Ligand binder design. Structure first.
Ligand SMILES: [Ca+2]
Ligand SMILES: [Cl-]
Ligand SMILES: [Cl-]
Ligand SMILES: [Cl-]
Ligand SMILES: [Cl-]
Ligand SMILES: [Fe+2]
Ligand SMILES: [Fe+2]
Ligand SMILES: [Fe+2]
Ligand SMILES: [Fe+2]
Lengths: 359, 358, 354, 355
């Protein structure tokens, strides 16, 4: 159990950007710029800095060339410069390794703290950032699949309750979770900015990065991404979806970048900003919890995720989950799911929904 | 099947299906309360339903009976005389016909039913009772509104044989699915200038694969899925939602209380020019049925509705001997590709996206 | 009135393309390609040939550089090559001037007949056309405002009944119209392809071309055109809309090209293919007939339209409408409209709505 | 100038609900429930408590039968019970009339403070509220025009700078505003919850309530409201729109209830929660500031607004704006607006855009 520090938590606004290490920068730029339409804030031979249509901070995604694809940092914006000091004190009290750079780790960010957090994830906290042209009314640029915001991260970690407590102390509130009737938590979603999530925990071997999520305005924009992927004959890079989530109630799509970093495209979750926002707990065997329409969750969605780096840039060693596996208990050999609680009709025993089994 | 000397009836479009249903109240709940179709007439025996933009009496007749099945798939013809032409055409084909001057179902007049050469019960009619066209009744409009009847899809063992017959009847092939060794797995064909009025799916038959209704927009289809989740009947969402390859339409397949399959469809393309370019897809192309490469659930290939003869008895099934689309794509000896010739993004002995057959 | 020929009418499939004369080709190209996203089928220093997303024939729009902006031809595809000969015999019997070019008037069209029709409009009939790549699944090209089909033309003409009967003899079926209780017809819509319209007649001084219309898939695509025009700071070229039509039930927008040629963007009218398709007549004073939400129709919509050319390329002289003016009876000083017939609440007298 | 209290401001979460006095409870029910599809949390013979599709607090709208149609309370929810204490001390230091009830003024709200604020508006602050079934996944109920959230209020007040300063001291941050080159402010928008607005000031004679705004998921849902109103042959109750706003970038529609209370339907503005969120100032003569597509703003939109009540339920006296009138300077007889700054082409003199 991760103790609550005496030192006050930094006041975190929102998820702000991810730095992903990529192996072939030109290939990755083709994906995020040509395919997905993100806007270039800056690039050179080593990095690409990208932002969403409605962003005014410098970037929402930095692609950094390196030998091993991995998450290098997941960055949260804090409310004041002094919150960066607070973050440093808070993580030092937690016994975590920290690194402070007054002029930033990446271009367009100023004073910044990176930490190896207690779950082994590389978090950044910053306030200072170079404002850029906010493109929110640049409909001359707007794509049929336009990514309008950065929405959230999702982290794979072996012990969800341990992580959840730590994130709650840091001021995130859990909006939804997935549990069973035997005490196991499989996943949790938690926010600062008043949407369903700024980050999220998925039970599994970790630390690994499950995905980064961008929003669109409307559901047809997500459909267009799928359609465009078909036209580009890269439909094999559509992992899962499109669908309606149970958890979050968002319309969603998961796609895979050239280094298999998973990207979620997301729209129309709900307001969570009230402090007594009702926490929704879904049962792990409810077949409408992940896809509301009951479509089966591909096994890769549970098993595959990106490496994460330490502050030296080396891959963090993976710690195996010992709690029950969501995959196993729902679609595995001894798995079970239901459409209606207590009804055998529309239930699935040892296989996935809709007539499929694990490959 | 030979081309008759007699002229084909001039067919306008698919118009309505009569489905036999076993429990009329449960079927009513599905078609009216879940799907929002509009009642034109009902009694203890039948429910007559129409789509939002329709002016003819109905697009769907649900008839209570002992064995769920397709009883008639009906096409409207251009003139009263075309019913006489249909009768002569099918008589020359040596098919059983039955003519009723005052119709088989309410709101249809002079009508001919035939057991066609493929074993399917076709109706041809001109005369129909017009009703209030609800197309601007936005006070009634559902978030999932079904706006038109679009097409039928028929399961039949020998696709080329059926195709040639429909071509003689004036349907024109728009798209099809073949392999490199000359097998045909499916064909789509039209009269009204959309991708299909009816379509042939290779398989044991005669069976009715589905009846399709349109929506205005893609979000309307999404809403049907969402509503089915809220009603906790997501298990009746068979396949989708998706984008089709063939037709380019956004789609969904759902199952009614008797397992009759309904497609919801939108935004296919114009085919009314006589030299409309045909499109042939390779059976192993994993974008042909779902453009996004999502797997086709095996029930989509195997399950379909019984059809009746003109006495109300079930038509006997003839087995397909040509290769099975399921088997050559997603079975244990199957394969499909994302890019022709590329092993990356290819699937061998299983479906796309990491699933095998359950 | 225009007598029915004994010669058989050509079998007309649909509206197919318009040739518009434009004064500055590069400015026109910016509007139709860069703003509206139409797809280049051919271009040179004198002409740009453009098509919609789902088209397989060579083009839906030809922009031709010339001294005077005008409609040069409104072209219908016919069902067979022999239908061009039928069109020639038909228009000759009508006493109309015709010109036949076996190798076409514009690139990508073959054997073609142009006529000065009885209403003074330059019609073209052709069958042969060069097929091109049908872009309907090219979602790598698809714009947020994508124009997917050519839908129809709309013609200003002084005597709507006279034109309507002529078009009916040619096989067009009227789907909707606007009339009053005194028996005046103000507009009619008519089709071959089984939508609400391939061409339409608006009562006014003519021959003039009121608009060319393109379809989108969905209503948001039309919204995007407006939003894009705002971002390009050319919102002054949004003439009317976006709205829901009463007539046609379509979602719509009217915009103006650099020569003030009017383009409609249109989606989601209904099927009219059955021969007893019910015809809808609206009362001219019904304030929901043109915009279903009761938004006012700006006067320019009724008064402004494009010149049309004769076969020598000279502008056709205009004949003034003598029947009542829809503008005058609805939004002019002695005009009126209602929301609910017979209710003075929601009625407008001597001005427009809202 | 309204002074900044020594007392700390309450932590305000968001706009939460409005209480509207209406004259015919059945006709108002028909509008809000049958036409617009809002969900009934509670009703009796005197009041109807309505909520949006995604709401979990008891209600977003209370219709209260009474003799004079008016805003009775615009309510904001605060972060903690102790913030209702903070509110009370804050408004007392401002010399405002206050009234606190530990068991609420309306059903479904607990300890609540109502005030006559320095601009003459009845504000309520509360934390405690009865939770109800959150209908956000009830797609069996979802309307083609579904109203999903309460988004904001908009207030008519004669002196916008004066009001703006007061709201900023209260913790609202200005996101967008409308000014001219002569030092006049015509409108401002300001937020707590990280959208463009929780309330907004429109320069005019006041206090009056300009509108209450509800969100939809998508733009087509707003189009459907218009289409439905045509089918019901009540298109005359569509005042303005649908449109794209300049200010806020939201897709919008303004309609009128049976007592002429103005309702906005709104979707797809942007995130403002960062504390250095860039302000956007529009010039009052820019014809894309209110409707981005340049559609004219009808004069009633500027002139008409709802009465508001004091804490005794009497109508607040209206104070006249003496600053320049947005109507007059843009669409009046000596008005002006432009499409492109400095371009005569596409400008309008003494008249509204589009003919
Ligand atoms: Ca258990
Ligand atoms: Cl999920
Ligand atoms: Cl398919
Ligand atoms: Cl109109
Ligand atoms: Cl505005
Ligand atoms: Fe996610
Ligand atoms: Fe189909
Ligand atoms: Fe038109
Ligand atoms: Fe507003």
């Amino acid at each position: 159990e991760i103790p609550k520090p005496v030192a006050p938590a930094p006041d975190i606004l929102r998820c702000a950007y991810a730095e992903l290490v990529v192996t072939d920068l030109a290939k990755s730029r083709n994906f995020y710029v040509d395919v997905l339409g993100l806007h270039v804030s800056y690039e050179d031979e080593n990095q690409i800095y990208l932002r969403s249509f409605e962003e005014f901070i410098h970037h929402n995604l930095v692609l950094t060339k390196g030998p091993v694809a991995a998450l290098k940092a997941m960055a949260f914006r804090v409310r004041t410069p002094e919150d960066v000091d607070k973050a440093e004190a808070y993580y030092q009290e937690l016994g975590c390794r920290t690194e402070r750079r007054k002029d930033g780790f990446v271009k367009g960010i100023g004073d910044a703290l990176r930490v190896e957090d207690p779950l082994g994830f590389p978090y950044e906290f910053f306030f200072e950032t170079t404002h850029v042209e906010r493109l929110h009314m640049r409909y001359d640029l707007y794509s049929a699949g336009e990514l309008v915001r950065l929405d959230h991260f999702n982290q794979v970690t072996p012990d969800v309750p341990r992580g959840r407590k730590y994130l709650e102390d840091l001021g995130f509130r859990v909006t939804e979770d997935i549990q069973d009737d035997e005490g196991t938590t499989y996943a949790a979603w938690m926010h600062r900015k008043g949407t369903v999530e700024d980050t999220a925990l998925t039970g599994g071997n970790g630390p690994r990065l499950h995905h980064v999520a961008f929003s669109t305005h409307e559901k047809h924009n997500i459909i267009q991404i799928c359609d465009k992927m078909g036209a580009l004959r890269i439909s094999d890079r559509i992992e899962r979806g499109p669908g309606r989530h149970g958890v979050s109630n968002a319309f969603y799509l998961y796609i895979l970048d050239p280094d298999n970093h998973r990207i979620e495209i997301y729209t129309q979750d709900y307001y969570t900003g009230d402090p007594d926002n009702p926490t929704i707990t879904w049962n792990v065997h409810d077949n409408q919890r992940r896809d509301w329409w009951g479509n089966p969750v591909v096994p890769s969605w549970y098993t595959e995720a990106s490496k994460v780096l330490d502050l030296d840039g080396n891959v963090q060693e993976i710690i195996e989950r010992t709690d029950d596996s969501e995959l196993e208990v729902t679609i595995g050999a001894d798995g079970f799911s239901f459409t209606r609680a207590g009804d055998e009709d529309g239930s699935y025993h040892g296989q996935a929904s809709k007539g499929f089994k694990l490959g």
